[PDB]
Every structure is written in structure tokens, then in C-alpha cells.
Structure 1
């Protein structure tokens, strides 16, 4: 509403002033935390763009380098798509604190259970070896970029929540407290003007009696 339900008195005035000061210090705390998260967001965006560009050029490298190692082992398409026992890249979740928020990122626990060991010892050697080296490094780099994107998303939503809280404390709460402070000042000023009138009446009656008697 336009005011807080309280009764005008010189005790309600200090209570309301305490409330106002507390609210407008909390506002500054939240306004600092939001800009911390915002700086982190603007950094994550830039380095995500750079990692995107570099992994894209790496992907084009791998695209033009696939054919030469393909030319040395026949056609292992059925071999690769039907024979898959156990992938040896794994991923786990870890946290990273930023101003109280817990961004989730990824840890790359490197497992080893290599099934692709036959791989034509005499039909495809260094070619396929460097090929899987390339693509494993690419897998790890894109793991890094995925962790960056996960951070990005959680940070982006927490920024919105904190800005909503700041705007609420700034547009809804503090104006209401200030309104119910101005009202209390007015009402105390109004209580004083009645005691003044009563005392002036008493004095007037005194100075009427003493003179007519």
C-alpha cells in the first residue's frame, strides 16, 4: 500500500529510520554482488567466443585431414559403428564459487579401456594413430567449452534474479518506508499544534481572571 501500518510516535520514527538505513545498505550489497557476477559473465562470453573460433578451425583441420588417413586403411565405417565396446573418455561434475553462486563445471577423468587396438596394425599405422590423437584432444577441448557454457547459463540466470531483487528493494520497499516516514513527521507536527493551543488557552484564562479580579 502507500504506507506501513504503524502509529505516529517518536519511537516509530527511529524504528522506521533504522529500517530505511538497513534496506538501503542491503541495496548496496546486492548492487555490488550483481556487478561482480556481471564482470564474470562478460569475461566468460569473450573467452567462450575465442574457444569457439579455435575449436572451429581445429574441426576444419580434422575435416581436411580425415581423408589422408582414410586412404590407408580401406573403409572402417562398419568396423567403427558396429564395434564399440567401451569409451575411455569420462566426465564428472565439480563446482566453482563466484560471489556465493555455485557454477557447475566439468572434470575430465581420463579412463583407459582402449578397445580400438587391432586397428589394422599392417593396414593403417601412424595415420590412424595421429588421427585419434587429434580427435581425443578435440574431445577434451570441447569438454572445456561445454563446462564454460554450463557456467554461462547458471550465471546468466542468477544475474537476473539478483537484479530483480535490487529493483524490488529500490522501487517498492524504500519508497514505502519514505512515505510512512514523511507521514509520521506530519502527524507529530500536528500533535504539537494542539498542545500549543491548549496552553495558550490556559494562559489567556489566567490573564483574564487576574485582570478582572
Structure 2
């Protein structure tokens, strides 16, 4: 967990850098996605795992087949936003794992 957290800090660093880059090239779109939240697509579920007779929990990521912001900013640019999407998806994977 210590090692994974050390990796987490750096990946958050460049994720925030790319976020700021996309915000520069796209203007102030934050309030849009803030107000357009309707449904999630990432979810989690808890399985059990017993070692040496004692139980501990484990979390797993499910990728529901749905989206809400699939085409935000279609007339100005959305490729940097898609880079943010995949970056933050792999971030969510890592965060759920260390959780």
C-alpha cells in the first residue's frame, strides 16, 4: 500500500496537469458537467477473501455500459477531454485497488 500510494501521488500530479491543459484549450466548461450529472457508469462491489481463517473485504470495479458526457463540447473540441476521461478511469482503477 505504501508503494501504491507513492505511485498514486505522481499519477495525480500529471493527471491534474493534463486537466489544466484541457481547461486551457476548452475554456470554462466545469459548470456544465457539474449541472449535467444524471447517472454513473463506474460502480463497485464487495467480495470476500479469507486467508488463514480470517476474512477481509475486497473491492472490484464494474464498467456499466453507459455515458452522459460522451459528446460534451462537440463543436469546439473534445479530444483532450477524452484523454482526461481515460486518465481518470485508470486513476479510478488504481484508487479502488488501493482502497
TM (normalized to structure 1)? 0.44
- Number of residues of Structure 1 aligned to a counterpart in Structure 2: 98
1:109: how far off? 1.4
1:118: how far off? 2.4
- Runs of at least 4 residues off by over 3 Å: none
- Residue 111 (1) aligns with residue 60 (2): no
Deviation track 1:74-124 (CA, whole Å, cap 9, x = no partner) reads 211110111101110000000111101111101111112200022112312
Query: The residue matched to 1:108 in structure 2 has which SS?
Result: strand
Deviation track 1:2-23 (CA, whole Å, cap 9, x = no partner) reads xxxxxxxxxxxxxxxxxxxxxx
Whose strand proportion is higher, 1 or 2?
2
1:50: how far off? 0.5
- Residue 101 (1) aligns with residue 54 (2): yes
**2:41 and 2:66 mapped to 1: Cα distance?**
6
1:135: how far off? 0.6
**2:4 and 2:75 mapped to 1: Cα distance?**
37
**1:124 and 1:136 mapped to 2: Cα distance?**
20
Q: Which structure 2 residue ranges, 5 or more long, are not aligned?
A: none
Deviation track 1:169-208 (CA, whole Å, cap 9, x = no partner) reads xxxxxxxxxxxxxxxxxxxxxxxxxxxxxxxxxxxxxxxx
Q: Which has the higher contact order (CA 8 A, sep 6+)?
A: 1
2:21 corresponds to which of 68, 86, 91: 68
1:65: how far off? 1.5
**2:28 and 2:2 mapped to 1: Cα distance?**
36
Q: Which structure 1 residue ranges, 5 or more long, are not aligned?
A: 1-47, 145-212
1:125: how far off? 2.3
Q: Note if contact 2:41-2:67 (Cα within 8 Å) is conserved in structure 1.
A: yes
**1:123 and 1:136 mapped to 2: Cα distance?**
23
**1:141 and 1:112 mapped to 2: Cα distance?**
20
- Decide which structure has the larger Cα Rg and report it: 1
Q: Note if contact 1:72-1:123 (Cα within 8 Å) is conserved in structure 2.
A: no
Q: Note if contact 1:69-1:124 (Cα within 8 Å) is conserved in structure 2.
A: no
